[PDB]
Short mmCIF file of all heavy atoms in Angstrom, two decimals:
data_model
loop_
_atom_site.label_atom_id
_atom_site.label_comp_id
_atom_site.label_asym_id
_atom_site.label_seq_id
_atom_site.Cartn_x
_atom_site.Cartn_y
_atom_site.Cartn_z
N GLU A 1 118.00 135.03 4.23
CA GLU A 1 117.72 133.62 4.69
C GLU A 1 117.64 132.72 3.62
O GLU A 1 117.94 131.56 3.69
CB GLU A 1 116.42 133.65 5.57
CG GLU A 1 116.51 134.55 6.78
CD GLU A 1 117.50 133.95 7.83
OE1 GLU A 1 117.62 132.70 7.91
OE2 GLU A 1 118.18 134.77 8.57
N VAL A 2 117.08 133.25 2.40
CA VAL A 2 117.00 132.28 1.25
C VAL A 2 118.33 131.98 0.65
O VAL A 2 118.63 131.00 0.19
CB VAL A 2 115.94 132.90 0.26
CG1 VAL A 2 116.37 134.28 -0.21
CG2 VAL A 2 115.74 131.99 -0.94
N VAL A 3 119.16 133.12 0.66
CA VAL A 3 120.54 132.85 -0.06
C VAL A 3 121.48 132.07 0.86
O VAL A 3 122.21 131.24 0.40
CB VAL A 3 121.15 134.27 -0.49
CG1 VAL A 3 120.31 134.84 -1.59
CG2 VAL A 3 121.28 135.28 0.63
N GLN A 4 121.37 132.29 2.14
CA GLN A 4 122.17 131.43 3.05
C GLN A 4 121.41 130.08 3.29
O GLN A 4 122.02 129.03 3.55
CB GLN A 4 122.30 132.00 4.44
CG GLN A 4 121.14 131.94 5.40
CD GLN A 4 121.30 132.79 6.61
OE1 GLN A 4 122.28 133.52 6.79
NE2 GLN A 4 120.35 132.59 7.57
N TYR A 5 120.18 129.97 2.81
CA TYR A 5 119.46 128.71 2.88
C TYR A 5 119.92 127.80 1.73
O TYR A 5 120.00 126.63 1.88
CB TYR A 5 117.94 128.99 2.81
CG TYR A 5 116.94 127.82 3.05
CD1 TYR A 5 116.24 127.98 4.27
CD2 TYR A 5 116.86 126.75 2.33
CE1 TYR A 5 115.34 126.95 4.64
CE2 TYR A 5 115.99 125.79 2.71
CZ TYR A 5 115.20 125.87 3.79
OH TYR A 5 114.34 124.89 4.26
N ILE A 6 120.17 128.49 0.65
CA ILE A 6 120.69 127.74 -0.61
C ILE A 6 122.11 127.31 -0.34
O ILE A 6 122.48 126.09 -0.75
CB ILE A 6 120.63 128.59 -1.87
CG1 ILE A 6 119.12 128.84 -2.24
CG2 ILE A 6 121.37 128.08 -3.05
CD1 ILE A 6 118.92 129.86 -3.35
N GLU A 7 123.06 128.09 0.31
CA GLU A 7 124.27 127.75 0.59
C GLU A 7 124.43 126.51 1.51
O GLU A 7 125.44 125.85 1.55
CB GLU A 7 125.10 128.92 1.27
CG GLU A 7 125.24 130.03 0.31
CD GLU A 7 125.34 131.42 1.08
OE1 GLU A 7 125.82 131.48 2.18
OE2 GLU A 7 124.85 132.42 0.51
N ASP A 8 123.44 126.21 2.31
CA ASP A 8 123.29 124.98 3.04
C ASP A 8 123.09 123.79 2.07
O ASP A 8 123.18 122.64 2.60
CB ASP A 8 122.22 125.01 4.00
CG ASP A 8 122.56 125.97 5.23
OD1 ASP A 8 123.77 126.17 5.43
OD2 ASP A 8 121.68 126.53 5.87
N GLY A 9 122.84 123.92 0.83
CA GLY A 9 122.55 122.88 -0.01
C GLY A 9 121.20 122.29 -0.02
O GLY A 9 120.84 121.30 -0.54
N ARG A 10 120.23 122.96 0.76
CA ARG A 10 118.94 122.49 1.00
C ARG A 10 117.89 123.30 0.34
O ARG A 10 118.01 124.58 0.15
CB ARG A 10 118.73 122.29 2.60
CG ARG A 10 117.43 121.72 3.10
CD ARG A 10 117.11 121.94 4.59
NE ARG A 10 116.94 123.42 5.04
CZ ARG A 10 117.91 124.18 5.39
NH1 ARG A 10 119.25 123.73 5.43
NH2 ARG A 10 117.61 125.42 5.84
N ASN A 11 116.77 122.64 -0.09
CA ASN A 11 115.96 123.21 -1.12
C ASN A 11 115.30 124.47 -0.77
O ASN A 11 114.52 124.58 0.22
CB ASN A 11 114.91 122.05 -1.48
CG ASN A 11 114.09 122.38 -2.82
OD1 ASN A 11 114.58 121.96 -3.86
ND2 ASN A 11 112.91 122.99 -2.62
N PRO A 12 115.37 125.48 -1.70
CA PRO A 12 114.78 126.87 -1.38
C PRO A 12 113.30 126.95 -1.49
O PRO A 12 112.69 127.84 -0.88
CB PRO A 12 115.48 127.66 -2.47
CG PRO A 12 115.59 126.82 -3.65
CD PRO A 12 115.91 125.44 -3.03
N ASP A 13 112.62 125.98 -2.09
CA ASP A 13 111.16 125.99 -2.12
C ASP A 13 110.62 125.62 -0.74
O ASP A 13 109.40 125.90 -0.41
CB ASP A 13 110.60 125.22 -3.27
CG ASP A 13 109.15 125.67 -3.74
OD1 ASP A 13 108.71 126.77 -3.22
OD2 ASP A 13 108.55 125.01 -4.50
N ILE A 14 111.42 124.89 0.02
CA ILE A 14 111.04 124.65 1.43
C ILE A 14 110.93 125.88 2.18
O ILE A 14 109.99 126.01 3.01
CB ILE A 14 112.00 123.55 2.03
CG1 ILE A 14 112.14 122.40 1.18
CG2 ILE A 14 111.47 123.18 3.36
CD1 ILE A 14 112.99 121.34 1.76
N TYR A 15 111.76 126.85 1.83
CA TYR A 15 111.71 128.13 2.50
C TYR A 15 110.37 128.83 2.28
O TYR A 15 109.77 129.40 3.23
CB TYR A 15 112.78 129.05 2.17
CG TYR A 15 112.82 130.41 2.64
CD1 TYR A 15 112.97 130.69 3.99
CD2 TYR A 15 112.63 131.51 1.72
CE1 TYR A 15 112.93 132.04 4.47
CE2 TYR A 15 112.70 132.81 2.17
CZ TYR A 15 112.81 133.00 3.63
OH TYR A 15 112.69 134.34 4.03
N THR A 16 109.84 128.86 1.04
CA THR A 16 108.52 129.26 0.77
C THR A 16 107.47 128.48 1.42
O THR A 16 106.50 128.92 2.05
CB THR A 16 108.27 129.37 -0.72
OG1 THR A 16 108.47 127.99 -1.36
CG2 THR A 16 109.12 130.38 -1.39
N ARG A 17 107.72 127.11 1.43
CA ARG A 17 106.73 126.14 2.12
C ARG A 17 106.65 126.32 3.53
O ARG A 17 105.56 126.62 4.07
CB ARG A 17 107.05 124.72 1.66
CG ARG A 17 106.45 123.75 2.59
CD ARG A 17 106.21 122.36 1.87
NE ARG A 17 107.47 121.54 2.06
CZ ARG A 17 107.66 120.39 1.44
NH1 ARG A 17 106.70 119.79 0.73
NH2 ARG A 17 108.75 119.62 1.76
N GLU A 18 107.79 126.35 4.16
CA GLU A 18 107.78 126.53 5.62
C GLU A 18 107.34 127.91 5.98
O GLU A 18 106.86 128.21 7.07
CB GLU A 18 109.23 126.23 6.16
CG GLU A 18 109.40 126.24 7.69
CD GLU A 18 110.72 125.79 8.25
OE1 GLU A 18 111.55 125.57 7.21
OE2 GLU A 18 110.99 125.77 9.32
N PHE A 19 107.60 128.94 5.11
CA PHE A 19 107.41 130.26 5.42
C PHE A 19 105.84 130.58 5.35
O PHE A 19 105.30 131.13 6.32
CB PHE A 19 108.10 131.16 4.35
CG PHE A 19 107.93 132.71 4.60
CD1 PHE A 19 108.71 133.22 5.60
CD2 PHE A 19 107.23 133.36 3.83
CE1 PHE A 19 108.66 134.54 5.86
CE2 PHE A 19 107.10 134.81 4.02
CZ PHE A 19 107.92 135.34 4.99
N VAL A 20 105.17 130.07 4.40
CA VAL A 20 103.69 130.23 4.24
C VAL A 20 103.00 129.24 5.33
O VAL A 20 101.97 129.61 5.83
CB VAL A 20 103.26 129.93 2.84
CG1 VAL A 20 103.33 128.49 2.44
CG2 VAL A 20 101.86 130.39 2.67
N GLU A 21 103.75 128.19 5.65
CA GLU A 21 103.14 127.44 6.79
C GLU A 21 103.32 128.14 8.05
O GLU A 21 102.37 127.92 8.96
CB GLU A 21 103.84 125.97 6.81
CG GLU A 21 103.36 125.00 5.84
CD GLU A 21 104.08 123.72 5.86
OE1 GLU A 21 105.37 123.79 5.99
OE2 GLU A 21 103.50 122.66 5.92
N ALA A 22 104.36 128.79 8.29
CA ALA A 22 104.44 129.87 9.50
C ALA A 22 103.26 130.86 9.50
O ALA A 22 102.75 131.15 10.45
CB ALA A 22 105.77 130.43 9.60
N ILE A 23 103.04 131.39 8.24
CA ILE A 23 101.97 132.36 8.12
C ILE A 23 100.63 131.75 8.52
O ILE A 23 99.82 132.33 9.34
CB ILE A 23 101.87 132.79 6.68
CG1 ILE A 23 103.21 133.56 6.19
CG2 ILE A 23 100.67 133.90 6.51
CD1 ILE A 23 103.23 133.86 4.76
N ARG A 24 100.29 130.54 8.01
CA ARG A 24 99.13 129.90 8.31
C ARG A 24 99.03 129.45 9.80
O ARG A 24 97.96 129.56 10.37
CB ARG A 24 98.92 128.63 7.40
CG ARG A 24 97.55 128.01 7.48
CD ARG A 24 97.47 126.63 6.78
NE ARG A 24 98.09 126.66 5.50
CZ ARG A 24 97.38 126.99 4.41
NH1 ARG A 24 96.08 127.39 4.54
NH2 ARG A 24 97.96 127.06 3.24
N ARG A 25 100.10 128.96 10.30
CA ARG A 25 100.15 128.56 11.65
C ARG A 25 99.90 129.67 12.71
O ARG A 25 99.09 129.64 13.60
CB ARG A 25 101.54 127.92 12.02
CG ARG A 25 101.65 127.34 13.35
CD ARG A 25 100.74 126.14 13.49
NE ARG A 25 100.89 125.34 14.79
CZ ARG A 25 100.07 124.52 15.27
NH1 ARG A 25 98.83 124.33 14.64
NH2 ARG A 25 100.33 123.84 16.31
N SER A 26 100.44 130.80 12.34
CA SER A 26 100.19 131.99 13.20
C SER A 26 98.84 132.52 12.99
O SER A 26 98.20 133.00 14.01
CB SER A 26 101.21 133.11 12.83
OG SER A 26 101.27 134.14 13.87
N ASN A 27 98.24 132.45 11.72
CA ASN A 27 96.86 132.83 11.53
C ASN A 27 95.89 131.90 12.28
O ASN A 27 94.91 132.48 12.96
CB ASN A 27 96.60 132.76 10.05
CG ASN A 27 95.15 133.17 9.71
OD1 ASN A 27 94.45 132.50 8.98
ND2 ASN A 27 94.69 134.21 10.39
N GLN A 28 96.16 130.60 12.34
CA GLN A 28 95.31 129.81 13.06
C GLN A 28 95.45 129.92 14.57
O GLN A 28 94.44 129.70 15.30
CB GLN A 28 95.59 128.29 12.66
CG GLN A 28 95.17 128.03 11.21
CD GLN A 28 95.58 126.66 10.73
OE1 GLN A 28 96.09 125.83 11.49
NE2 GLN A 28 95.29 126.39 9.40
N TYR A 29 96.66 130.20 15.07
CA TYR A 29 96.90 130.43 16.50
C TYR A 29 96.05 131.70 16.79
O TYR A 29 95.32 131.69 17.88
CB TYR A 29 98.33 130.67 16.76
CG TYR A 29 98.61 130.81 18.25
CD1 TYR A 29 98.64 129.68 19.00
CD2 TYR A 29 98.98 132.06 18.83
CE1 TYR A 29 99.07 129.81 20.38
CE2 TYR A 29 99.36 132.05 20.11
CZ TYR A 29 99.37 131.02 20.91
OH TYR A 29 99.67 131.16 22.27
N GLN A 30 96.14 132.72 16.07
CA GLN A 30 95.38 133.93 16.30
C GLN A 30 93.82 133.72 16.23
O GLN A 30 93.13 134.23 17.01
CB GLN A 30 95.85 135.03 15.40
CG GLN A 30 95.20 136.39 15.65
CD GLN A 30 95.64 137.04 17.00
OE1 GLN A 30 96.76 136.66 17.40
NE2 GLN A 30 94.79 137.74 17.64
N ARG A 31 93.47 132.89 15.29
CA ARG A 31 91.98 132.61 15.15
C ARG A 31 91.47 131.80 16.31
O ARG A 31 90.35 132.00 16.82
CB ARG A 31 91.71 131.92 13.82
CG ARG A 31 90.24 131.78 13.48
CD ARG A 31 90.04 131.06 12.13
NE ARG A 31 90.78 131.72 11.08
CZ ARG A 31 91.54 131.09 10.14
NH1 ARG A 31 91.65 129.77 10.27
NH2 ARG A 31 92.09 131.77 9.24
N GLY A 32 92.26 130.87 16.84
CA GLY A 32 91.87 130.08 18.03
C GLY A 32 91.90 130.99 19.20
O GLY A 32 90.93 130.89 20.01
N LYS A 33 92.85 131.90 19.35
CA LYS A 33 92.82 132.90 20.52
C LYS A 33 91.50 133.79 20.31
O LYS A 33 90.88 134.14 21.30
CB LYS A 33 94.02 133.74 20.43
CG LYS A 33 94.24 134.54 21.70
CD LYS A 33 95.49 135.33 21.60
CE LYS A 33 96.72 134.52 21.22
NZ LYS A 33 98.05 135.31 21.36
N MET A 34 91.17 134.14 19.14
CA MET A 34 90.03 134.99 18.79
C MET A 34 88.72 134.34 19.24
O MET A 34 87.86 134.88 19.98
CB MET A 34 89.97 135.14 17.28
CG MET A 34 90.79 136.40 16.66
SD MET A 34 90.86 138.04 17.18
CE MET A 34 89.16 138.36 17.83
N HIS A 35 88.55 133.12 18.82
CA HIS A 35 87.42 132.28 19.31
C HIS A 35 87.34 132.04 20.78
O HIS A 35 86.25 131.95 21.39
CB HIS A 35 87.31 131.06 18.43
CG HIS A 35 86.86 131.17 17.06
ND1 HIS A 35 87.38 130.38 16.03
CD2 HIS A 35 86.01 131.98 16.46
CE1 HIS A 35 86.77 130.79 14.84
NE2 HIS A 35 85.99 131.71 15.08
N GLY A 36 88.55 131.83 21.40
CA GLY A 36 88.57 131.59 22.81
C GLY A 36 88.14 132.86 23.57
O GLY A 36 87.44 132.76 24.52
N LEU A 37 88.66 134.05 23.16
CA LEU A 37 88.17 135.25 23.69
C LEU A 37 86.67 135.54 23.52
O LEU A 37 85.97 136.01 24.40
CB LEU A 37 89.00 136.44 23.11
CG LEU A 37 90.45 136.60 23.57
CD1 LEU A 37 91.15 137.65 22.67
CD2 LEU A 37 90.50 137.00 25.03
N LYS A 38 86.00 135.08 22.32
CA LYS A 38 84.67 135.19 22.15
C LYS A 38 83.91 134.29 23.26
O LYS A 38 82.91 134.62 23.70
CB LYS A 38 84.31 134.87 20.72
CG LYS A 38 82.87 134.87 20.36
CD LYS A 38 82.26 136.33 20.54
CE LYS A 38 83.05 137.26 19.51
NZ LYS A 38 82.22 138.45 19.11
#
């Protein structure tokens, strides 16, 4: 995904940025579900 991401001409640090944002988004979704179950 990073090498085909570069071949699109679009910035590869966005892949890290969007990727860690997906990590945080899923973590917060899980934490909200956690607190809702509590």
Side-chain angles (χ1 to χ4, degrees):
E1 300 291 326
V2 59
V3 291
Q4 82 187 8
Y5 195 111
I6 290 172
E7 291 151 37
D8 288 334
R10 183 199 60 279
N11 189 89
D13 206 8
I14 308 185
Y15 174 65
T16 57
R17 164 154 87 183
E18 187 176 1
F19 183 76
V20 72
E21 278 175 315
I23 301 171
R24 190 195 308 278
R25 186 63 171 164
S26 196
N27 180 222
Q28 292 175 6
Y29 187 75
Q30 188 65 32
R31 193 180 302 131
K33 194 184 307 196
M34 273 314 326
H35 285 144
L37 286 169
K38 181 66 58 153

